[PDB]
Amino acid sequence: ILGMDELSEEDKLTVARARKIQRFLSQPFQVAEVFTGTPGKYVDLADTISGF
Amino acid sequence: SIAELGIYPAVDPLDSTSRMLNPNVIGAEHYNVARGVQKVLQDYKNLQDIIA
Amino acid sequence: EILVTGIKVVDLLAPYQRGGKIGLFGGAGVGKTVLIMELINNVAKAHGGFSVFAGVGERTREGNDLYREMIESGVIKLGAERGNSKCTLVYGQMNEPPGARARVALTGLTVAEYFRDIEGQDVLLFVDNIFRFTQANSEVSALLGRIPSAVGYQPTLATDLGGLQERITTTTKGSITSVQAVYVPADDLTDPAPATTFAHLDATTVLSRSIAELGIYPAVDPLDSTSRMLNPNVIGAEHYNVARGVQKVLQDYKNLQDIIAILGMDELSEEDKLTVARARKIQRFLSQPFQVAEVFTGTPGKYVDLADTISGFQGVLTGKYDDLPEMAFYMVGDIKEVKEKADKMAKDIASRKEADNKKVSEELK
Amino acid sequence: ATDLGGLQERITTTTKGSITSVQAVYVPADDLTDPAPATTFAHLDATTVLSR
Amino acid sequence: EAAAPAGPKEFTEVWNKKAPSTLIVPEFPSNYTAVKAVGEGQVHGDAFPVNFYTPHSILSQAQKDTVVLPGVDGYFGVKASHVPTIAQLKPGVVELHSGAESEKFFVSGGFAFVHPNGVTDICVLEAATLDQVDPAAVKSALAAASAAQPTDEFEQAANRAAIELYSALESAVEAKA
Amino acid sequence: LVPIGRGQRELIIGDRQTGKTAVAIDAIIHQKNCNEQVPKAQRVYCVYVAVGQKRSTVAQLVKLFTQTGAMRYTIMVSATASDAAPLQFLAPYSGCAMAEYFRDTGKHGLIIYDDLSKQSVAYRQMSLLLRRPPGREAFPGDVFYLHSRLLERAAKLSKELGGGSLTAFPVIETQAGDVSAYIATNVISITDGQIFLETELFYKGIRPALNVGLSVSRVGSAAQFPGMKQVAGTLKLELAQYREVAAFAQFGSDLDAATQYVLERGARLTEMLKQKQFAPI
Amino acid sequence: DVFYLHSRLLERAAKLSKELGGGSLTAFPVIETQAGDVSAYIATNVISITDGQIFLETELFYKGIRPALNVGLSVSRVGSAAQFPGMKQVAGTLKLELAQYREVAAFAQFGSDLDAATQYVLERGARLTEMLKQKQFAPIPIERQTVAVYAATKGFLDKVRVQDIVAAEEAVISQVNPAVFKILKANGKITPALDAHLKAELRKVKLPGA
Amino acid sequence: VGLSVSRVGSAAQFPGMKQVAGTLKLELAQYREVAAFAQFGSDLDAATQYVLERGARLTEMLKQKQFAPI
Amino acid sequence: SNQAVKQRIRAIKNIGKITKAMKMVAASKMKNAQIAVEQSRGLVDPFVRLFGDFPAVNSNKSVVVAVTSDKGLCGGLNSNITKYTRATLATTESEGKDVVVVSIGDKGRSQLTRIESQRYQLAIADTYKVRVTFGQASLIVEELIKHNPQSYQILFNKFRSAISFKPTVATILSPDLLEKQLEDVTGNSLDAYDIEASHERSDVLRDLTEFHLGVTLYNAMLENNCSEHASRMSAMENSTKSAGEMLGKLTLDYNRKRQATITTELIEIIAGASALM
Ligand SMILES: Nc1ncnc2c1ncn2[C@@H]1O[C@H](COP(=O)(O)OP(=O)(O)OP(=O)(O)O)[C@@H](O)[C@H]1O
Ligand SMILES: Nc1ncnc2c1ncn2[C@@H]1O[C@H](COP(=O)(O)OP(=O)(O)O)[C@@H](O)[C@H]1O
Ligand SMILES: [Mg+2]
Ligand SMILES: [Mg+2]
């Protein structure tokens, strides 16, 4: 309703970190590689805690 | 709701149907008047949540 | 003839008949036992006749509390001076099987009926949860092999309740002033056990849960409690007019609740937002500290005379008190104590003293 | 409650292994206090909401 | 002569002793301006603060060293420590120099104050700069302004204002660099 | 607004403590005041049937009718709450049969079945204990017929049978304005008119608390006093305007001077119809 | 007879007389409501059986306030004459200041104006709320509770930032001399000789953040 | 169109209709979101008014007459 | 009963759309009216440094102006400066002066005649319908100088931000009737300026006070218009929030009544079947 540059720069960083969190929650699946080509990735728990 | 506006007969225009409302049966210049009346009254019923 | 109770909302908007049947409606923690104990404390101590407390389907803790509290007050005396007691307790509390709770109100009624018929005097019958009589018959009647009625109750609800209630009357030989608390299930007044009780009562006092959640105690709904004494030929002209004016202000405020909720207070007319302010004043002013609630509140109890209630509410209605805050009216006795509390709370915003007044730093030995 | 409990109480971790059940939950009339989800939710330990 | 010290300092007194306490003392337009007129400084040498104003725009807040303003008694020029002057301006061009570069706006007429601290305030209504005026519709308008002499003094004054604006807009559109 | 003819059935439907018994008592007291000024072929003899009330309330009404003087024209058939359910079921029929003597001898009757809901409750009890299968709200199947065969006995007879009349005023108590309940819809369907009273108008000071929109009289203005008819269509029309230009009267800021005259004129009319009880005009 | 199902059960939780032993049974019946509906059938059954009520709010529970006590609804008219007399005199101040914090934040959520005295009781009541948070499976003795209520309602925990009070009321109990809690447990009451002493030991407290 | 679902129509319609119907049902997904909002047509943003006019174009486009299937 | 709740739910669900729509509409109007307001803020400064700011003058005739809104869904903005104009009319009126009250906006004529009926003499409205210009503000100013007062007081809400709207009172004096008298400081404070007018100082001060009244009226009714939009955007966001909360409670109660309805008719069917079988 107001605009992207309306809010602060720490709000810009909240937007940026949340947009790269929203993409980092995505994952290619090993069962869906037959019709999407790219191989799927089983991410361990010790890796996703550290990554986030 | 038609009746406590004092309108008699209190026939709901947007609930009364007939199988004689084909353009094949009563002709097009009657059916277009009836459909336009129902369209106008339904849009007024939509606008009554603002204009009240 | 009127019965002055000391409670402002009761004496103003639904006055009790001296010799009539009184019902306190409300469900599950609205305050119809604290109301019945304040009615005991006010009416029964200044009565002169005998009392009968019939505890039907209530807590045994509450019955033991009433027995010990009545021993301390001398209403029940033990031992050699026992005959100078003024109360009979008949207890059929909620640990009893449904045959006992369905019939203990009849036992308390018989103890009251003897004093009315044979001794021929005015008595008080306090029945806590007459709904438990209806409920206990509803528990039994599932096993007496009957088709059930509406919500799940017995088919003979109205006649059982009627044949019990038609014995609790004032006659030519005596009086029974009956105060019965009536539970409502799920806070539903359209339940058949309260809706059948409504017809047997002269004064109705409907306690509602939302008014209790507003902090207003006694949580009497003023727009749902009625009386047959609210009649200009019974209580007078100015009392009835003040009561109808308070109810008109409260109804006009109840009709403004939706737009105040969704549009805000700032969009009414000026007479509308005068009505809203006077109604928020008389909602707080109908509340009162009880002398039986002073052990778990800390406020002293405030017996208000009937003339004090009429004078104070006429003052708020005409507009003599548009200047005080709203919380000046909250939990006070009468129209002097709203001004006392106004200066008590407007000296409080000026209450800032110097140097913290220590005299504690290294007190010598 | 007893039929749902007799089903869902066999899905536990024993000493020998475990069963972990992923259950699709339909909510009747979009009412979370309806007795079928309100009895089903007493057993669930996690919810995985797939949104459009 | 000075027997009524009015002001926002002193309105607070008579207001606080006579208005209800739920309202704080209302604000005043002098609370929003930082630059006064009689106060010390704001010249510092050559460039003085010029404030060019219209109701719908602010065209200059920058410091300039000379301003050429078109007063009703002729185009005058405002140097740094210029004498304080409330000058009514006729239709003409306002030139705000800073050095080699200058901004030439043709204005419509309206006052221009120079203050005792060197603050210059040009206050016009419509400042239509010279590279957005057309040179064709000016003659189409002053033709009717030359021709029309009505019976009433009101449209007479309007036509005289018309010709003194359009004639000045003639002289500053052919002789531009 | 809701004019009532000799021989029609006018329902008094409302919540509890809204003015139903008050309208009934005013209707009886006014027939006492009218019987002195009319000849014997114009008199109305009232019958009050009290089903499911207290004995205290009925004794209070009998004391009121003796102090006014209405008991030389009034019968009171009282099946109170302590009485058996077959007595409360049969008391409207008993009162209507005592009132049908006046309908059948060419005189005029006024029967008031106070709490016809309580008669339906007594009939439900009496039919559930006789093991008849229940229906909607555990009522019997023929709880419509229970009330239709009673309320149809109120008639204006032809001149061959004497020209007598019986005017019935059944009273139905609703639960928080719910007129969609079973017995409420049945007796709304049976009777000609309905006098719907509200518990929200009752606390606005409007007493008798008549909902002027939902109150109908299907005898129409055919059974109205002339002259009252000359003012009543106007009063109805301005009240109809005052009702509809309201729900905007909260915004008293903008004076519109065409709606505002209608609003304060309807306020004059709405304040006009307020009335203290036990004094019919 | 579903009312008799629980009233037959919950009436056996009694405090017996001295002639029967003086033994006691304290019950804690647990009811799960659906959407915060305390006007259900079984919920209103047990509300009219039990003495008090501990109402746990689901919107206080997601704002981190745990135990999510609905302080306005949570009542107990039977424990009043049954509280620790050291707590009875310091938490009589706690529930009333939480009442004003419940009055301010229920109307001034719009951001209309700060009256600068209702604005005081908003971040005072926010300090009493954060003082009343608690972790799980870590109960506190009643003496180490009524000092943390003493440290907060007497303004010793004032101007500590509200995201420090979990770490600050741990600073209070850790630094105050453990002989303070031994006098307070044994007298059961903050005696005049002790609050003068306990006010001293609270001034010598390294609050976090200063 | 918001409440009527078909859980087959993913790869079970006409391909020439599938080229276009994704855009048609995503343009109507914005129109149903902004329609009951901007019932008035007075003070409008230049992005919301465009999807309002597009949704009003598609709405009159989809309606057809009886007993004449296309 | 169980159907009227389903219509009340749809009504509140539609109000929660209409108020969200006009919250966005008021936001779009506020973001482009703030642009005109902070450009209009410049021209008021040379007059308040040239003529000073004297609110508490001994005018014997005053014209107060309360600059209100036209659309009345603003949230306590118009009555705020009604309180302020009855506070400033109870600040200057202590000496027996004539006061004319005018108002800009229909919410001014509906809230000023309630507090004061006799001094109110003029109602300007329909100002913000198309836009607000300086020719319009100057026409309003000329209709204000149809009276001949010695002072003018403007009351308006100044757009400090989208949250704060400080109610500003703005004062203008008649030229040598009061402006030359209030400047006499053992001489004059205006003699430092060299008048470059075509005529004498009284005529240039008359023209200057008319131009000052015009620019403060234009800035006043720009600031009040965009602060009106900001208070409408904030007042329809406390409105859609409350209409979402009311809708949530209505949906929960409707679901309770729905479940109780299905159980009620089911129990009646079971009772009727067991009464036979
Ligand atoms: N026109 C009136 N003016 C003043 N008071 C009235 C008027 N009508 C009714 N009342 C009062 O309002 C109350 C209405 O009670 P009423 O006689 O209507 O009982 P009811 O609604 O018929 O039946 P129930 O007692 O079961 O509710 C009475 O106290 C009566 O005195
Ligand atoms: N008059 C009152 N004043 C203050 N609080 C009250 C009052 N009545 C009830 N309460 C509060 O509500 C609770 C319920 O009181 P009680 O009369 O026992 O209700 P009920 O018998 O209807 O369950 C009390 O424990 C108290 O917390
Ligand atoms: Mg109780
Ligand atoms: Mg009655």
Side-chain angles (χ1 to χ4, degrees), chain F residues 22-277:
Chain F
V23 171
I25 285 160
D26 292 336
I28 291 176
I29 288 176
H30 192 39
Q31 303 309 316
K32 198 268 301 182
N33 305 151
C34 282
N35 279 359
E36 304 157 343
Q37 324 179 12
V38 296
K40 69 193 202 70
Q42 290 271 311
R43 302 183 133 98
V44 165
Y45 306 95
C46 299
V47 183
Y48 187 86
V49 173
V51 176
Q53 294 177 229
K54 306 199 293 175
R55 261 149 191 189
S56 175
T57 306
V58 174
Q60 190 75 42
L61 297 199
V62 169
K63 173 215 191 185
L64 167 64
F65 290 158
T66 55
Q67 288 177 178
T68 296
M71 279 310 284
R72 59 180 293 218
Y73 306 111
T74 310
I75 322 169
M76 197 165 304
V77 185
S78 71
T80 59
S82 67
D83 286 353
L87 293 175
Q88 314 190 37
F89 146 76
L90 268 191
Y93 300 100
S94 168
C96 178
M98 292 172 190
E100 272 175 353
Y101 167 74
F102 314 114
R103 184 187 54 81
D104 289 330
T105 43
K107 274 160 281 286
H108 298 259
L110 171 57
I111 171 72
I112 293 172
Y113 321 96
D114 212 326
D115 287 337
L116 209 62
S117 292
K118 290 186 171 53
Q119 194 246 337
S120 67
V121 166
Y123 183 57
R124 167 175 71 184
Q125 161 176 343
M126 206 186 56
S127 295
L128 284 184
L129 297 166
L130 282 175
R131 282 289 180 160
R132 307 200 182 178
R136 207 187 140 204
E137 307 186 12
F139 272 110
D142 48 356
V143 81
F144 167 76
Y145 172 53
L146 172 79
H147 285 145
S148 72
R149 85 177 187 263
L150 167 78
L151 282 167
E152 275 280 313
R153 296 163 64 165
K156 176 77 177 63
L157 298 194
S158 58
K159 298 306 179 183
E160 283 88 24
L161 256 63
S165 67
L166 187 63
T167 315
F169 278 73
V171 182
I172 291 292
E173 160 181 339
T174 54
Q175 305 292 142
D178 194 357
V179 298
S180 69
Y182 193 25
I183 311 298
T185 53
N186 284 345
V187 192
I188 278 168
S189 305
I190 287 154
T191 60
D192 303 2
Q194 48 167 346
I195 297 177
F196 188 57
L197 313 172
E198 281 194 15
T199 184
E200 293 81 17
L201 305 169
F202 189 79
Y203 286 124
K204 284 177 198 180
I206 302 177
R207 284 177 287 272
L210 195 141
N211 190 7
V212 299
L214 295 189
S215 294
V216 191
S217 169
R218 303 189 212 187
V219 81
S221 296
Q224 201 162 15
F225 183 66
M228 184 51 103
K229 185 148 55 185
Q230 302 169 17
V231 314
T234 58
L235 171 78
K236 183 260 301 177
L237 193 62
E238 313 165 64
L239 277 179
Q241 292 157 12
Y242 166 69
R243 281 191 328 263
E244 205 274 330
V245 309
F248 313 111
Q250 323 98 344
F251 312 111
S253 320
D254 39 355
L255 186 140
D256 311 336
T259 81
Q260 184 145 342
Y261 153 72
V262 160
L263 272 184
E264 64 189 3
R265 173 60 166 267
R268 303 307 190 279
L269 302 180
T270 317
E271 288 274 332
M272 176 49 63
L273 294 174
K274 309 186 173 189
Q275 180 170 168
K276 314 174 201 306
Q277 66 171 340

Side-chain angles (χ1 to χ4, degrees), chain H residues 2-68:
Chain H
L3 279 190
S4 62
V5 172
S6 177
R7 48 176 61 236
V8 176
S10 176
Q13 55 176 331
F14 196 61
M17 190 47 93
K18 198 159 48 190
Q19 301 267 0
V20 185
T23 313
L24 162 67
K25 81 195 304 292
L26 187 46
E27 286 291 325
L28 277 176
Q30 302 164 359
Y31 171 58
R32 296 184 321 256
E33 186 66 31
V34 308
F37 282 167
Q39 289 296 131
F40 45 81
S42 53
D43 320 274
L44 294 178
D45 175 36
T48 299
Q49 196 261 357
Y50 171 56
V51 309
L52 273 174
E53 290 266 20
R54 177 59 87 81
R57 257 56 171 261
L58 301 171
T59 299
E60 319 278 331
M61 185 266 303
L62 288 164
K63 50 196 216 181
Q64 74 164 44
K65 56 179 51 59
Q66 203 182 4
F67 308 141

Side-chain angles (χ1 to χ4, degrees), chain C residues 327-342:
Chain C
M327 284 307 172
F329 299 93
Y330 185 77
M331 294 296 182
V332 287
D334 42 353
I335 210 64
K336 288 164 285 294
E337 295 194 56
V338 297
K339 316 172 307 195
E340 290 172 15
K341 201 193 185 179

